[PDB]
Design an enzyme around this catalytic site. Structure first.
Site, PDB file in Angstrom:
ATOM      1  N   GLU A  95       0.800  -1.223   0.000  1.00 50.61           N
ATOM      2  CA  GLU A  95       0.000   0.000   0.000  1.00 50.61           C
ATOM      3  C   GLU A  95       0.835   1.276   0.000  1.00 50.61           C
ATOM      4  O   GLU A  95       1.973   1.271   0.470  1.00 50.61           O
ATOM      5  CB  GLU A  95      -1.037   0.015   1.137  1.00 50.61           C
ATOM      6  CG  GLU A  95      -0.484  -0.104   2.548  1.00 50.61           C
ATOM      7  CD  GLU A  95      -1.379   0.571   3.565  1.00 50.61           C
ATOM      8  OE1 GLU A  95      -2.118  -0.144   4.279  1.00 50.61           O
ATOM      9  OE2 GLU A  95      -1.371   1.822   3.616  1.00 50.61           O
ATOM     10  N   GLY A  96       0.254   2.344  -0.548  1.00 53.05           N
ATOM     11  CA  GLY A  96       0.850   3.672  -0.619  1.00 53.05           C
ATOM     12  C   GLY A  96       0.146   4.646   0.304  1.00 53.05           C
ATOM     13  O   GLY A  96      -0.486   4.224   1.279  1.00 53.05           O
ATOM     14  N   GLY A 147      -3.811   4.682  -1.838  1.00 52.71           N
ATOM     15  CA  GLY A 147      -4.159   3.494  -2.611  1.00 52.71           C
ATOM     16  C   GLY A 147      -3.586   2.245  -1.966  1.00 52.71           C
ATOM     17  O   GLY A 147      -2.792   2.334  -1.016  1.00 52.71           O
ATOM     18  N   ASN A 185       9.099  -7.942  -6.522  1.00 56.22           N
ATOM     19  CA  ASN A 185       9.897  -6.985  -7.272  1.00 56.22           C
ATOM     20  C   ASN A 185      11.297  -7.524  -7.610  1.00 56.22           C
ATOM     21  O   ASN A 185      11.757  -8.475  -7.000  1.00 56.22           O
ATOM     22  CB  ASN A 185       9.920  -5.612  -6.589  1.00 56.22           C
ATOM     23  CG  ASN A 185      10.853  -5.452  -5.415  1.00 56.22           C
ATOM     24  OD1 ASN A 185      12.058  -5.690  -5.508  1.00 56.22           O
ATOM     25  ND2 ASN A 185      10.333  -4.900  -4.326  1.00 56.22           N
ATOM     26  N   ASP A 236       9.926   6.867 -12.632  1.00 54.76           N
ATOM     27  CA  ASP A 236      10.497   6.125 -11.489  1.00 54.76           C
ATOM     28  C   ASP A 236      10.917   4.695 -11.883  1.00 54.76           C
ATOM     29  O   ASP A 236      10.585   3.725 -11.200  1.00 54.76           O
ATOM     30  CB  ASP A 236       9.595   6.146 -10.226  1.00 54.76           C
ATOM     31  CG  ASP A 236      10.287   5.655  -8.952  1.00 54.76           C
ATOM     32  OD1 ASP A 236      11.519   5.865  -8.818  1.00 54.76           O
ATOM     33  OD2 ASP A 236       9.609   5.027  -8.112  1.00 54.76           O
ATOM     34  N   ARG A 294      12.712  -1.889  -8.017  1.00 51.52           N
ATOM     35  CA  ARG A 294      11.559  -1.977  -7.095  1.00 51.52           C
ATOM     36  C   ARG A 294      10.220  -1.901  -7.838  1.00 51.52           C
ATOM     37  O   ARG A 294       9.214  -2.377  -7.324  1.00 51.52           O
ATOM     38  CB  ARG A 294      11.619  -0.882  -5.997  1.00 51.52           C
ATOM     39  CG  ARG A 294      11.664   0.564  -6.544  1.00 51.52           C
ATOM     40  CD  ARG A 294      11.795   1.649  -5.473  1.00 51.52           C
ATOM     41  NE  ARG A 294      12.021   2.970  -6.074  1.00 51.52           N
ATOM     42  CZ  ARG A 294      13.219   3.522  -6.240  1.00 51.52           C
ATOM     43  NH1 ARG A 294      14.311   2.889  -5.830  1.00 51.52           N
ATOM     44  NH2 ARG A 294      13.336   4.702  -6.829  1.00 51.52           N
ATOM     45  N   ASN A 295      10.216  -1.295  -9.045  1.00 45.88           N
ATOM     46  CA  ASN A 295       9.021  -1.105  -9.858  1.00 45.88           C
ATOM     47  C   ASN A 295       8.935  -2.074 -11.043  1.00 45.88           C
ATOM     48  O   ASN A 295       8.155  -1.862 -11.979  1.00 45.88           O
ATOM     49  CB  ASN A 295       8.908   0.352 -10.285  1.00 45.88           C
ATOM     50  CG  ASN A 295       8.613   1.269  -9.135  1.00 45.88           C
ATOM     51  OD1 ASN A 295       7.770   0.975  -8.284  1.00 45.88           O
ATOM     52  ND2 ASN A 295       9.304   2.394  -9.082  1.00 45.88           N
ATOM     53  N   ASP A 348       3.520   0.470 -12.350  1.00 45.54           N
ATOM     54  CA  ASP A 348       3.387   1.912 -12.078  1.00 45.54           C
ATOM     55  C   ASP A 348       3.786   2.823 -13.250  1.00 45.54           C
ATOM     56  O   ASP A 348       4.304   3.925 -13.026  1.00 45.54           O
ATOM     57  CB  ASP A 348       4.162   2.303 -10.793  1.00 45.54           C
ATOM     58  CG  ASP A 348       3.308   2.484  -9.558  1.00 45.54           C
ATOM     59  OD1 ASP A 348       2.140   2.928  -9.697  1.00 45.54           O
ATOM     60  OD2 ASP A 348       3.825   2.251  -8.444  1.00 45.54           O
TER      61      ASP A 348
HETATM   62  C1  LIG Z   1      -2.307   1.428 -11.608  1.00 47.34           C
HETATM   63  O1  LIG Z   1      -1.033   1.346 -10.947  1.00 47.34           O
HETATM   64  C2  LIG Z   1      -0.481   0.069 -10.736  1.00 47.34           C
HETATM   65  C3  LIG Z   1      -0.512  -0.979 -11.672  1.00 47.34           C
HETATM   66  C4  LIG Z   1       0.061  -2.204 -11.343  1.00 47.34           C
HETATM   67  C5  LIG Z   1       0.665  -2.419 -10.093  1.00 47.34           C
HETATM   68  C6  LIG Z   1       1.277  -3.746  -9.747  1.00 47.34           C
HETATM   69  C7  LIG Z   1       0.220  -4.815  -9.359  1.00 47.34           C
HETATM   70  C8  LIG Z   1       0.844  -6.095  -8.983  1.00 47.34           C
HETATM   71  C9  LIG Z   1       1.549  -6.441  -7.843  1.00 47.34           C
HETATM   72  C10 LIG Z   1       1.964  -7.787  -8.067  1.00 47.34           C
HETATM   73  N1  LIG Z   1       2.743  -8.661  -7.274  1.00 47.34           N
HETATM   74  C11 LIG Z   1       3.332  -8.420  -6.027  1.00 47.34           C
HETATM   75  C12 LIG Z   1       4.121  -9.414  -5.368  1.00 47.34           C
HETATM   76  C13 LIG Z   1       4.648  -9.062  -4.127  1.00 47.34           C
HETATM   77  N2  LIG Z   1       4.449  -7.804  -3.571  1.00 47.34           N
HETATM   78  C14 LIG Z   1       3.713  -6.939  -4.290  1.00 47.34           C
HETATM   79  N3  LIG Z   1       3.552  -5.702  -3.772  1.00 47.34           N
HETATM   80  C15 LIG Z   1       2.654  -4.708  -4.365  1.00 47.34           C
HETATM   81  C16 LIG Z   1       3.271  -3.866  -5.399  1.00 47.34           C
HETATM   82  C17 LIG Z   1       4.526  -3.775  -5.859  1.00 47.34           C
HETATM   83  C18 LIG Z   1       4.496  -2.746  -6.813  1.00 47.34           C
HETATM   84  C19 LIG Z   1       5.625  -2.230  -7.658  1.00 47.34           C
HETATM   85  N4  LIG Z   1       3.304  -2.237  -6.934  1.00 47.34           N
HETATM   86  O2  LIG Z   1       2.470  -2.938  -6.029  1.00 47.34           O
HETATM   87  N5  LIG Z   1       3.123  -7.198  -5.487  1.00 47.34           N
HETATM   88  N6  LIG Z   1       1.572  -8.242  -9.253  1.00 47.34           N
HETATM   89  N7  LIG Z   1       0.852  -7.173  -9.791  1.00 47.34           N
HETATM   90  C20 LIG Z   1       0.725  -1.381  -9.160  1.00 47.34           C
HETATM   91  C21 LIG Z   1       0.167  -0.136  -9.465  1.00 47.34           C
HETATM   92  O3  LIG Z   1       0.150   0.957  -8.612  1.00 47.34           O
HETATM   93  C22 LIG Z   1       0.929   0.899  -7.408  1.00 47.34           C
END
Ligand SMILES: COc1ccc(CCc2cc(Nc3ccnc(NCc4cc(C)no4)n3)[nH]n2)cc1OC
Ligand SMILES: COc1ccc(CCc2cc(Nc3ccnc(NCc4cc(C)no4)n3)[nH]n2)cc1OC
Lengths: 279, 287
Positions: free
Chosen positions: B29-30, B33, B109, B151, B155-156, B169
């Site tokens: 989480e942010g 969101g 990530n 960014d 990490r992204n 992102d």
């Molecule tokens: C509209 O904006 C977005 C579009 C897509 C995403 C990513 C969604 C997602 C997360 C995962 N898998 C895991 C596994 C382990 N840990 C995580 N952590 C969550 C996390 C990391 C990041 C980078 N973003 O969310 N995710 N698969 N798919 C995030 C967005 O906004 C923050």
């Protein structure tokens, strides 16, 4: 007046003072420095007090000279050659190293003077360890072992200098001496031969990065936090896993577990012989 | 917002009925969101479950945060599908909170993925160049769709169960703000983006060079112990991060090229994809 020591005394008319070497140390020519050969000139370095010095600065220069007398001669240290103590300012005469400090020597030889092979770099490390092992055998603790305090002669021999505090104070090049200090020397003011071994580890890093600056952009407060976290500098490129393991061993959190200069000299001797001169 | 305070506009192409989504454990989480793991019953055509990631607003969000989430979803529709990006799969926009349904990457990530695989599922030099190639391919696609990331960092980048790299992102910014892991995002920014606020596909190329450094250090931290003010001073001096160990002179030249002071002298994502494609094929899988 200063007391006269005939073993070391050189008459003043035997010394021709020349250009300053750095900010005071001047280049000079000594006529018949050796009693057996009176018609030969030797290029020497002369350390003298500046016109603004005090009675404390004089006692410091005298003590440095006296310490060098006690330590004795070694190939990998800047040796004492003589002194002018009578009828004028005190001149402390030491060996001249024409190729400057090890940091500048390595930087000037980075790929685009000449190029240094892997064996040459391991040889610099061996020579410094050798000089340090001799100083340790004479019960001397350096406290500022760094590439800037190692001098290189015309024949590429490594010689350790300045062997005989405000953390936020910077050098001429703009570097922080705390970045060479063992954590126990930094946080508990405990200085031993093991704290110098930690500094030698930072010196090894400087050699294999060819005059690289430790922790660039890192201020004092952030360095303290890196050391408290047990952070260690990264393996340089063009550095074996064995040489990085040596640096890490020198950087052991526990001083008793770090290698000694005697062990470092033995390990480096074996590594030199096994290191290629072909690249 | 444009009637969005009371109701969102429909898009039947993407709409999934709410009873076909089973919300699960949170992923992260942010500030306003959050992302949760979920199971979606029959996304395409009909009755099979797919593990998905769902982005939604937190209970403390404002009208501005809703318009931001809507805009992200609308941007994802415009961008289209690509193997090396997190793709849009659907949305729940009607009669309840907005849910943005995207692809789930199970191995987390890239920074964590590489750190967990440091020697004591080991990665070869070909696997590392392959990560770099896949990220460049995703970035080349995003750039072709006029998307500037801003960014781009390990990490992204998310890694799927099948080890596919997927980019996620895709005055307002505070330089002194830190990440969860405690790193400073400014350490990935191009000097023109940092000092002149000029963001282009060339500024993302600079970030990709920092990402390349993170790959070849297996999740290493850029400039450790360096504060913002000192980083500005390193960039002004033309300081460049050192060549990592177990990195060819060719790959370090690629990083340095990405870090050209002149943005027009940096390679493009198209050039990086071509170079990386040739390097992968020539890189050994034996070490
Ligand atoms: C509209 O904006 C977005 C579009 C897509 C995403 C990513 C969604 C997602 C997360 C995962 N898998 C895991 C596994 C382990 N840990 C995580 N952590 C969550 C996390 C990391 C990041 C980078 N973003 O969310 N995710 N698969 N798919 C995030 C967005 O906004 C923050
Ligand atoms: C009494 O304590 C000392 C004992 C020995 C020395 C070293 C004297 C010296 C200098 C050189 N060669 C060069 C070449 C290029 N540039 C320099 N710069 C001067 C400088 C650098 C360092 C290290 N020390 O002085 N020197 N050879 N030999 C200095 C001492 O005091 C600070």
């Amino acid at each position: 007046e200063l007391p006269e020591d005939p073993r070391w005394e050189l008459p003043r008319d035997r010394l021709v003072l020349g250009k300053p070497l750095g900010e005071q140390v001047v280049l000079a020519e000594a006529i018949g420095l050796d009693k057996d050969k009176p018609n030969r000139v030797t290029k020497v370095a002369v350390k003298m007090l500046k016109s603004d010095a005090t009675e404390k600065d004089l006692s410091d220069l005298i003590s440095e000279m006296e310490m060098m007398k006690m330590i004795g001669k070694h190939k990998n240290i800047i040796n004492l050659l003589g002194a002018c103590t009578q009828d004028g300012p005190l001149y402390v005469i030491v060996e001249y190293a024409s190729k400057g400090n090890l940091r500048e020597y390595l930087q000037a030889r980075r790929p685009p003077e000449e190029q240094l092979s892997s064996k040459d770099l391991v040889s610099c490390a061996y020579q410094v360890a050798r000089g340090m092992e001799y100083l340790a055998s004479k019960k001397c603790i350096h406290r500022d072992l760094a590439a800037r305090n190692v001098l290189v002669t015309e024949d590429n021999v490594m010689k350790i200098a300045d062997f005989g505090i405000d953390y936020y104070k910077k050098t001429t090049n703009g570097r922080l001496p705390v970045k060479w200090m063992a954590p126990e020397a930094l946080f508990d003011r405990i200085y031993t031969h093991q704290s110098d071994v930690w500094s030698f580890g930072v010196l090894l890093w400087e050699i294999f990065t060819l005059g690289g600056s430790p922790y660039p952009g890192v201020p004092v407060e952030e360095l303290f936090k890196l050391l408290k976290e047990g952070h260690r500098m990264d393996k340089p490129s063009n550095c074996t896993n064995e040489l990085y393991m040596m640096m890490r061993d020198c950087w052991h959190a526990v001083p008793s577990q770090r290698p000694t200069f005697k062990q470092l000299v033995e390990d480096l001797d074996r590594i030199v012989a096994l290191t290629s001169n072909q690249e």
